[PDB]
Enzyme design. Structure first.
Site, PDB file in Angstrom:
ATOM      1  N   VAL A 120       0.934   1.615  14.015  1.00  0.00           N
ATOM      2  CA  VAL A 120       1.373   2.505  12.948  1.00  0.00           C
ATOM      3  C   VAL A 120       0.401   2.394  11.778  1.00  0.00           C
ATOM      4  O   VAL A 120      -0.044   1.297  11.416  1.00  0.00           O
ATOM      5  CB  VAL A 120       2.828   2.203  12.535  1.00  0.00           C
ATOM      6  CG1 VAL A 120       3.001   0.789  11.999  1.00  0.00           C
ATOM      7  CG2 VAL A 120       3.326   3.220  11.515  1.00  0.00           C
ATOM      8  N   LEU A 140       7.960  -3.541  12.621  1.00  0.00           N
ATOM      9  CA  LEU A 140       6.833  -4.158  13.306  1.00  0.00           C
ATOM     10  C   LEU A 140       6.376  -3.364  14.528  1.00  0.00           C
ATOM     11  O   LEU A 140       5.950  -3.961  15.523  1.00  0.00           O
ATOM     12  CB  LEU A 140       7.189  -5.594  13.707  1.00  0.00           C
ATOM     13  CG  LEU A 140       6.049  -6.616  13.743  1.00  0.00           C
ATOM     14  CD1 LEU A 140       5.307  -6.630  12.417  1.00  0.00           C
ATOM     15  CD2 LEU A 140       6.572  -8.000  14.094  1.00  0.00           C
ATOM     16  N   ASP A 141       6.483  -2.040  14.488  1.00  0.00           N
ATOM     17  CA  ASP A 141       5.911  -1.228  15.550  1.00  0.00           C
ATOM     18  C   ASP A 141       4.387  -1.325  15.509  1.00  0.00           C
ATOM     19  O   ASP A 141       3.788  -1.207  14.436  1.00  0.00           O
ATOM     20  CB  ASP A 141       6.349   0.230  15.411  1.00  0.00           C
ATOM     21  N   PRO A 142       3.736  -1.573  16.640  1.00  0.00           N
ATOM     22  CA  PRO A 142       2.270  -1.582  16.660  1.00  0.00           C
ATOM     23  C   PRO A 142       1.699  -0.186  16.493  1.00  0.00           C
ATOM     24  O   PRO A 142       2.383   0.824  16.680  1.00  0.00           O
ATOM     25  CB  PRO A 142       1.920  -2.142  18.046  1.00  0.00           C
ATOM     26  CG  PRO A 142       3.175  -2.502  18.699  1.00  0.00           C
ATOM     27  CD  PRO A 142       4.340  -2.083  17.881  1.00  0.00           C
TER      28      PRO A 142
END
EC number: 5.4.99.-
Lengths: 141, 94, 58, 344, 49, 58
Positions: free
Chosen positions: D81, D77-79
């Site tokens: 990407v 859930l890295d923003p």
RNA sequence: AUAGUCUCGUCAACGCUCGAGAGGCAGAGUCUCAAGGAGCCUCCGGGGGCUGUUGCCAUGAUAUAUAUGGAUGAGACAGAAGUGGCCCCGUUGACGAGACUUAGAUUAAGUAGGCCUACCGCAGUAUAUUCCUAAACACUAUGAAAUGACCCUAGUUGGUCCAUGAUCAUUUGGGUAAAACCAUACUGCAGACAUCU
């Protein structure tokens, strides 16, 4: 006779990078010979490893036709640890001939300023420009 | 301050106001664990643990009046004994 | 040392006293390298062989 | 000649043959030959996720566009990407984590806060960060922030501009590895400081960006085409079967008469075994497929190769998770010679 | 610095005394072995003293 | 956005920071276009891609 | 009781390279040894040959020392120091000690109770609900763009973002905050060795 640059290329180890070009190989061998006249040289794995561990600075020249490969497989990363440039040449007989010994040697560490004598200092001053341009061309690779 | 402190890290370089240290201790530090000297005086707390298993580094969150540029290479930084936990915990269990 | 070898088509060793064979291939030293149990350069060897895919099982 | 066969039927002649003869049942279909409702309900989308929305919002968007009953993903859930995002539709959600051991791949841009004195040091720092690593999840991630060990298997520095202070590198990493923390660590080892400017996932599990990756515009346009034109070709083109998620699993082919019993929860026995992989080890995770190539279940192997080849009866596999519906195939148990002989 | 110099001097004196004692020991055991070979039996400790 | 790509001989992407490669090929942006769930232009996109055969189903 | 296996420490017998040192290997410190010098002849101050199968160092090893090797090393300190750094023969039989067993190798759909229940296999449902409200992220509505906007002790020509929408203001309105698995409860489907020719 056939030059050892073209002769020893089949025997060159896979990890022997960077490998010198023929003009660069000639310049490195000439610089090694001048340093050996200056006695500013460390010959063999034992001397080169000990000088690297003490913190000596210069240039490392490693032969490519080394069998078995575990003789010299720790030298390049050890040079990277101590921020010393290194280059590979295909022949150990030529390295021994330039290193002022009759038998071949595996690795040569040119350490400028390693001679206490003043004549060695004068010889260091006269091969210094060649050493500098060789080191710059090696680091340009 | 604790009576027994163990040498934890060696100075590497400053980084953005933080002190980077190569770990000279076999164990892993606790998060926000205080960092001392031989004089038992606190210079800061552990900010980040990073690096591979063979070569662990940690950055120290410097306190008030403690500057990263004031320290030089070869300076040792000390941690309390209870603030270390074994590295076997982070590895997966067999 | 004097014992040299090459690799045959099957992969097995052919032992010679010659540095260069009749076909022109440079021979290899049969004896292994010197080992010390207090060696401290596994990291360097592993890094160098891993740069070129020379690690077994890689 | 079997290399061009689709999905799990690819290279099926390499499978060892336990029984060469069977009588087919005209039930079910190929994964590519399903009807559109069963095709979507068993579908997987390799989506080119954009930067601005999160993955949860994208999954909700796909659910609303395709009118699904549920959609799911198992991505980090890295923003910000972009790139590969595997969206599982309905039943395929149960295979949302079937490729966690495959890992992931990233192409990442690191921005350095200052210009390096030595260029090559950056690459050296990247070579220091390859291997087992100590990482803590960032503040943005929903995972609890405790120190873990994550393995970066192989990394390569593509380019570096020291004047632009931007370095593009490719990394192959274990699932659960954060590239934001990797960029911060790279800046910490360099000493100038650094962070992650852009991030792109080029491979997620088995599927990659070259493996039929589509955009959200493609999903919406295909749904529009099917709604107004009743044309399935574009919707069938963008949507992949769930069997794509089951590649790399050891395959066991099951007789048709033994399919539905496995769907009812029965153990697979030797008389129902048809073909199997070389090298199946006890307690391996395997996939049970039919002769048509559709996946019955994920199972656990109860026999090894010698027992699979030379045992006349016994438990072959036990169902870990059933993909196929009950009663898609007829109930044919109780009709075999040994069972009818004991009943008589 | 004075403490370091004193330690080096003490170590040099110790190793010199060790060398002298080993030289005397090996010379005495060699001449004792020769005297035992000539005598043909065990030698008393009074003669060694 | 900074990440650009070009197409190699095998068909896989070669990633770069440069607008034009050394061989002179113009690089393409690697990131997709921005999507909005309230977009109302599927008909226009589908018609234009059918006019040139760019529909994946076609 | 009998018998077997595993882990061990002594004796006897028979073999072998004949087995504990003033030993060897690994490692640390210091020192010596690498044709790095000298002469001669050529070529254009340097390069190439000759002296030079020379010289320097080590080696008597079942041994040619007029020999064999030399940094992918050797020697001395060192018959030392140290070993809480390691190494120094094999087979059979007997004796003694501690254990584990004393085993005939089952099961083509399960287990336990009083024909029925409970557990077991698989698939589902639920794990707070409604309204108001705070926050985050992204979009969208309106106005503002090339003298565009923002940041930095600030530029011999700084850096970043920017019509692929930056950065500002009003609130125009809706969206997202998952999925998979574990645990508990409930519901349903079966108890299937897989014929089909």
């Amino acid at each position: 006779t056939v030059d050892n640059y073209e002769a020893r290329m089949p025997a060159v180890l896979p990890f022997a990078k960077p490998l010198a070009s023929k003009k660069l190989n000639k310049k490195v061998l000439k610089t090694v010979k001048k340093a050996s006249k200056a006695k500013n040289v460390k010959r063999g794995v034992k001397e080169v490893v000990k000088a690297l561990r003490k913190g000596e600075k210069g240039l490392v020249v490693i032969a490519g036709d080394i069998s078995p490969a575990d003789v010299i497989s720790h030298i390049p990363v050890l040079c990277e640890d101590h921020s010393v440039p290194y280059i590979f040449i295909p022949s150990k007989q030529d390295l021994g001939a330039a290193g002022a010994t009759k038998r071949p040697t595996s690795v040569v560490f040119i350490v400028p300023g390693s001679n206490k004598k003043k004549d060695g200092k004068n010889k260091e001053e006269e091969y210094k420009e060649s050493f500098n341009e060789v080191v710059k061309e090696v680091q340009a690779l | 301050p604790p009576d027994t402190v163990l040498e934890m890290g060696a100075f590497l370089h400053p980084c953005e106001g933080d002190i980077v240290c190569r770990s000279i201790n076999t164990k892993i530090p606790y998060f926000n664990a205080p960092i001392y000297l031989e004089n038992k005086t606190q210079v800061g707390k552990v900010d980040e643990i990073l690096g591979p298993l063979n070569e662990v580094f940690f950055t120290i969150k410097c306190g008030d009046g403690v500057q990263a540029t004031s320290f030089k290479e070869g300076d040792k930084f000390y941690i309390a004994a209870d603030k270390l936990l074994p590295i076997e915990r982070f590895l997966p269990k067999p | 040392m004097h014992l040299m070898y090459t690799l045959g088509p099957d992969g097995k060793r052919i032992y010679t006293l010659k540095k260069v064979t009749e076909s022109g291939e440079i021979t290899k030293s049969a004896h292994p390298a010197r080992f010390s149990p207090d060696d401290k350069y596994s990291r360097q060897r592993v890094t160098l062989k891993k740069r070129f895919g020379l690690v077994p099982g890689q | 000649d079997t290399s061009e066969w689709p999905l799990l039927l690819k290279n099926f002649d390499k499978l060892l043959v336990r029984s060469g003869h069977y009588t087919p049942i005209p039930a079910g279909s190929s994964p590519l030959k399903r009807d559109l409702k069963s095709y979507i309900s068993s579908g997987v989308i390799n989506l080119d996720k954009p930067s601005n929305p999160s993955s949860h919002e994208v999954v909700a968007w796909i659910k609303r566009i395709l009118r699904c009953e549920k959609t799911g993903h198992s991505g980090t859930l890295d923003p910000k990407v972009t790139g590969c995002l595997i969206v599982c539709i309905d039943r395929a959600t149960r295979l949302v984590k079937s490729q966690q051991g495959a890992g992931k791949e990233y192409v990442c841009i690191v921005r350095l806060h200052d210009a390096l004195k030595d260029e090559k040091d950056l690459g050296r720092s990247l070579e220091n960060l390859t291997g087992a690593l100590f990482q803590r999840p960032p503040l943005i991630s929903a995972v609890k922030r405790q120190l873990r060990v994550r393995t970066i298997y192989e990394s390569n520095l593509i380019e570096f501009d020291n004047k632009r202070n931007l370095g593009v590198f490719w990394a192959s990493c274990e699932a659960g590895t954060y590239m934001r923390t990797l960029c911060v660590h790279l800046g910490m080892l360099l000493g100038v400081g650094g962070h992650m400017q852009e991030l792109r996932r080029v491979r997620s599990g088995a599927l990659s960006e070259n493996d039929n990756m589509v955009t959200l515009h493609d999903v919406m346009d295909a749904q529009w085409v099917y709604d107004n034109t009743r044309d399935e070709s574009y919707l069938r083109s963008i949507i992949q079967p769930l069997e794509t998620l089951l590649v790399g699993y050891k395959r066991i082919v099951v007789k048709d008469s033994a399919v539905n019993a496995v769907c009812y929860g029965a153990k697979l026995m030797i008389p129902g075994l048809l073909r199997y992989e070389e090298g199946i080890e006890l307690y391996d995770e395997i996939v049970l497929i039919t002769t048509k190539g559709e996946a019955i279940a994920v199972a656990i192997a109860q026999m090894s190769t010698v027992d699979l080849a030379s045992c006349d009866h016994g438990v072959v596999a036990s169902v870990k998770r059933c993909i196929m519906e009950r009663d898609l195939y007829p109930r044919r148990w109780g009709l075999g010679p040994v069972a009818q002989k004991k009943k008589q | 610095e004075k403490r370091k110099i004193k330690e080096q001097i003490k170590a040099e004196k110790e190793t010199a005394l060790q060398k002298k004692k080993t030289k005397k020991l090996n010379k005495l055991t060699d001449i004792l072995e020769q005297l035992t070979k000539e005598y043909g039996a065990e030698i008393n400790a009074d003669m060694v003293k």
